Design a protein around this ligand. Structure first.
Ligand code: A1CYF
Ligand code: ZN
Ligand code: ZN
Ligand code: ZN
Ligand code: ZN
Lengths: 73, 70
């Protein structure tokens, strides 16, 4: 029905919000510190000296173990 | 249709996985450091001495701004 298509869209948008904002291909699993923006995968976060959301300097990157994480397994 | 019900369930489960493992009422927005477990809201994370997932000592709590926040 039309509601099947609406639910498909909601699910797709929620899953897209879980993906790295830079590469769009890998799940978010890293936090820029100290600002706290958690919007990248580990590969993109290692290459940024400034937060892509707020432009604060990145002192270091903290890996995050989230419950929403999914993998090939 | 039955497909609408299947998608409703997938959405519900993903949203439930984003809630604090202690209170089950507030969204996750805090990380235990240095272990990195990000499973609690700010209120529940504030008084824990050890991580509720892996038992590592909590040196500090880092607030996280996630794109899934609603
Ligand atoms: C809340 C909340 N958001 C997430 C989240 C956000 C982006 C990516 C991933 N994997 C999880 N988990 O809990
Ligand atoms: Zn990336
Ligand atoms: Zn930032
Ligand atoms: Zn809580
Ligand atoms: Zn832990």
């Amino acid at each position: 029905s039309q509601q099947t298509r609406v639910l498909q869209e909601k699910l797709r948008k929620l899953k897209e919000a879980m993906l790295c904002m830079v590469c769009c291909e890998e799940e978010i699993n890293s936090t820029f510190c100290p600002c706290g923006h958690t919007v990248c995968c580990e590969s993109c976060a290692a290459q940024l000296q400034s937060c892509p959301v707020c432009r604060s300097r990145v002192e270091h990157v903290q890996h995050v173990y989230l419950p929403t994480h999914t993998s090939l397994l």
